[PDB]
RNA sequence: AGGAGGUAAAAUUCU
RNA sequence: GUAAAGCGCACGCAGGCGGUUUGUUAAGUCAGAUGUGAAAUCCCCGGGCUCAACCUGGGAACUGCAUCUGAUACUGGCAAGCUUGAGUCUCGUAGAGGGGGGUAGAAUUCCAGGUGUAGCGGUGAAAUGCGUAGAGAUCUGGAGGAAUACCGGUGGCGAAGGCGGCCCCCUGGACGAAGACUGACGCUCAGGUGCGAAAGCGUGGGGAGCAAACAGGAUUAGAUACCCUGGUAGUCCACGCCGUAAACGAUGUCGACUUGGAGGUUGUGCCCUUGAGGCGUGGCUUCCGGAGCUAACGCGUUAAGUCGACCGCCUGGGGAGUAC
């Protein structure tokens, strides 16, 4: 689950202060950040089915809570995906 | 789950009173209180406390007799996946009169005994006997 | 209000969970009991067996298990009633319609341990005849000469008298027993916690209920 | 007083 | 659960369902009012053909629809919140969780020799087979493949299938503790996606053991078997198929609620390390068992007890999980 140090960086700008660790902005950011790095892990290995199963949770959850906010505070999303990368 | 809390309420007290408990702690909602009040107003319990806070906690006491519970039946009728509403003329007589049927209405909650002598209807919530 | 000294509550991790409301025990694991629950369960139990001992009532001492066996064989022979001491015969009450007719085979050959023929015939009839007398007298002083429907009996250990308590409950007869920390109360309308097991402790209840009943109404 | 290892081979059918 | 019936497993769209407080609307819900709901028919009370069937007067009934006006508890919509369901951060815990590469040690087989001599092997008993080029036995040395004794255990881990020597790299999940942030972000899930023992298929590589097929020895009435000497596919690796098992606990997932006893195992908070503690509190887990449930067997806080959300499935044996 990446480094205990890491994510320290990403709570800023996304969050209003450090240890504001629960804004939906950050977890999404935490998830993507892992996922992205973590796609390297499945390049090599790749027949590591089990590890993948955990991945999709990250992806499922990410997407599930990326949909939550779509209902609350409009364009509190259109100010973060492009800020990050993903709307495919 | 926390999906049908009134039914969770009626369960608490059902295998509550079957288990011969003294009373039962419970989360509170502005509804649960209003149904408790009718179990008070009809003596299926002795009385209920809110034991509140910002995280309310309505407790409420037993009520036994000889050796048994006074609630010889307490089931949930209308419910989340199957809502039930009756008209005024057509509403239920639990044990054909003895024992009640608690029923919401444009005027608060209220009982079936009461439901008619008033003259209206609504969501029949549980049958109590 | 101790009255009874070295006594407390005995027996260990067996305990009927539905015997929580009367027991403030723990202690090395042998959980002791609320004693000001037992003595008001006397002053109600030891009490209301004179409302009946005045009604010309007929009790029945019940105590078996090789431990203070014939401790119950005592004033019991007097205490406006009698006892029963070695193994509970399946339904002496319950099936009084018979076994009642084995008092007969006793008191017949009892008044015959001394009266009429008590030696005349062979001395091989010698022991085998008294062997009958020997085998049931330590099994039914139980009746000797009785009279009624023995209403309310008194059992030492509640569930060791497994049978007795149930048989009584099927017949409507009262109850009156003690429960240490493992026997099922449930079927004893007059429940007196304490302890079933101790030669000392048992003779206290025995001595205390032997009193109070003896004063029927003179 | 525990464990261990070795002791029966094949042999159908009944309006 | 065993009678027919829980998808082998999980992830998730639609949909169903949803914590808790204020307002707000009046959709659902409830009350009234008006309209209408043809007549005949059924029903109630009458009338009339000699009675009856039948005809007939009047009523009730037509369980309903629409509109206007209200009521606003419950459901829904809109609004704003709340933190307890839920997730995020922090330091750690144990684990055969998964993937990659590495290496050890014991044995079987084989290759080369040394010594050594007529037997070895195998079975119920045999024989096939192996041995006079020397077997079996033994010693030394060297190949190669597969599997990890002891730990190991009603032990752990995984969603299920399933995972056991040792070593580092990558990675998943579970759980504990304090506090911090989030503020219902949920549960379930037809469709859809993916995972899925063994045998099996493709391409090649690999091949010590084992072993379908096949062969020879027995056995037997027969012996296409069970037993013995051999033995190929395969069992091993790589990459792509296949998608089924008594894939089982024959018991769908989530949450809440109800006496107990022995444990097993892994955390952690407090108190003379004052023990290999004293006192608690979490998660998982094995046996016994109350109430209750059950057709009975049995289940029994890890329910098959008490409830509620949502899904899947059964409707007599066959025909048949067959045909199209
Ligand atoms: Mg035969
Ligand atoms: Mg034949
Ligand atoms: Mg079946
Ligand atoms: Mg299943
Ligand atoms: Mg609701
Ligand atoms: Mg007429
Ligand atoms: Mg009409
Ligand atoms: Mg509302
Ligand atoms: Mg060698
Ligand atoms: Mg080697
Ligand atoms: Mg880890
Ligand atoms: Mg696959
Ligand atoms: Mg295979
Ligand atoms: Mg192949
Ligand atoms: Mg199938
Ligand atoms: Mg299995
Ligand atoms: Mg059991
Ligand atoms: Mg338990
Ligand atoms: Mg269940
Ligand atoms: Mg087919």
The helicity of chain B comes to 10-25%
Helix proportion range of chain A: 40-55%
- The domain count of chain B comes to 2
Q: Largest beta sheet of chain B, briefly?
A: 3 strands, antiparallel
**3D shape of chain A:** globular
CATH topology of the largest domain in chain B: Ribosomal Protein S8, Chain: A, domain 1
Number of strands of chain B: 7
Structural class of chain A: mainly alpha
The ordered string of helix (H) and strand (E) elements of chain A is: HH
- Estimate nothing, just give the exact number of structural domains of chain A: 1
Radius of gyration of chain B: 14 Å
Characterize the biggest β-sheet of chain A.
none
Which structural class do the helices and strands of chain B define? alpha+beta
PDB class: ribosome
Keywords: ribosomes, tRNA, transfer, 70S, 16S, ribosome
Entry title: 4,5-linked aminoglycoside antibiotics regulate the bacterial ribosome by targeting dynamic conformational processes within intersubunit bridge B2
Chain A: 30S ribosomal protein S15
Describe the protein in words.
Chain A is mainly alpha-helical and 88 residues long. Helix content of chain A is 47%, strand content 0%. The radius of gyration of chain A is 14 Å and the shape is globular. Chain B has 129 residues and is of the alpha+beta class. In chain B, a hairpin with a 2-residue loop joins strand 3 (64-65) and strand 4. Chain B is globular, with a radius of gyration of 14 Å. The relative contact order of chain B is 0.18. Chain C has 218 residues and is mainly alpha-helical. Chain C has a domain at 96-140: Helix hairpin bin (Helix Hairpins), CATH 1.10.287. Chain C is built from five helices and three strands. The chains hardly touch. Chain B: One of its GO terms (molecular function) is rRNA binding. Chain B: Pfam families: Ribosomal_S8 (PF00410). Chain B: One of the primary rRNA binding proteins, it binds directly to 16S rRNA central domain where it helps coordinate assembly of the platform of the 30S subunit. Chain B: Belongs to the universal ribosomal protein uS8 family.
Comma- or semicolon-separated keywords:
part of a larger assembly; 3 chains; B: 129 residues; alpha+beta; Ribosomal Protein S8, Chain: A, domain 1; Dna Ligase, domain 1; 3-stranded antiparallel β-sheet; two-stranded antiparallel sheet; 3 helices; 7 strands; 24% helix; globular; C: 218 residues; mainly alpha; Helix Hairpins; 5 helices; binds magnesium ion; RNA-binding; zinc ion binding (chain C); ribosomal protein (chain C); Small ribosomal subunit protein uS2 (chain C); Ribosomal_uS2_CS (chain C); Ribosomal_uS2_bac/mit/plastid (chain C)
């Amino acid at each position: 689950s990446l480094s205990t140090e890491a994510t320290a960086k990403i709570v800023s700008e996304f969050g209003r202060d450090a240890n504001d660790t629960g804004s939906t902005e950050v977890q999404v950011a935490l998830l993507t950040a892992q996922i992205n790095h973590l796609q390297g892990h499945f390049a090599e290995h790749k027949k590591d089915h089990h590890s993948r199963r955990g991945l999709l949770r990250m992806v499922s959850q990410r997407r599930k809570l990326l949909d939550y906010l779509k209902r609350k505070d409009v364009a509190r999303y259109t100010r973060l995906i492009e800020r990050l990368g993903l709307r495919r | 789950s926390m999906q049908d809390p009134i039914a969770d309420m009626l369960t608490r007290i059902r295998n509550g009173q079957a288990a011969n408990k003294a009373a039962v702690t419970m989360p509170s909602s502005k509804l649960k209180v209003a149904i408790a009040n009718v179990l008070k107003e009809e003596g299926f319990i002795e009385d209920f406390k809110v034991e509140g806070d910002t995280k309310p906690e309505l407790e409420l006491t037993l009520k036994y007799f000889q050796g048994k519970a006074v609630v010889e039946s307490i089931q949930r009728v209308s419910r989340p996946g199957l809502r039930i509403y009756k008209r005024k003329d057509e509403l239920p007589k639990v044990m054909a009169g003895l024992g009640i049927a608690v029923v919401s209405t444009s005027k608060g909650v209220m009982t079936d005994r009461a439901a008619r002598q008033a003259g209206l209807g609504g969501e029949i919530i549980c049958y109590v006997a | 209000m101790l009255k009874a000294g070295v006594h407390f509550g005995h027996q260990t991790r067996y305990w009927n969970p539905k015997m929580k409301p009367f027991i403030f025990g723990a202690r090395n694991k042998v959980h002791i009991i609320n004693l000001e629950k037992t003595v008001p369960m006397f002053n109600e139990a030891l009490a209301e067996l004179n409302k009946i001992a005045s009604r010309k009532g007929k009790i029945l001492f019940v105590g078996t298990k090789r431990a203070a066996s014939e401790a119950v064989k005592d004033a019991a022979l007097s205490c406006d009633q009698f006892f029963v001491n070695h193994r509970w015969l399946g339904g002496m009450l319950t099936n009084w319609k018979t076994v009642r007719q084995s008092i007969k085979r006793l008191k017949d050959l009892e008044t015959q341990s001394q009266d009429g023929t008590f030696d005349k015939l062979t001395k091989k009839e010698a022991l085998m005849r008294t062997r009958e007398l020997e085998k049931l007298e330590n099994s039914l002083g139980g009746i000797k000469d009785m009279g009624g429907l023995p209403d309310a009996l008194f059992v030492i250990d509640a569930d060791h008298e497994h049978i007795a308590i149930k048989e009584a409950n099927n017949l409507g007869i009262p109850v009156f027993a003690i429960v240490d920390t493992n026997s099922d109360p449930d079927g004893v309308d007059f429940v007196i916690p304490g302890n079933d097991d101790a030669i000392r402790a048992v003779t206290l209840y025995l001595g205390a209920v032997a009193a109070t009943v003896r004063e029927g109404r003179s």
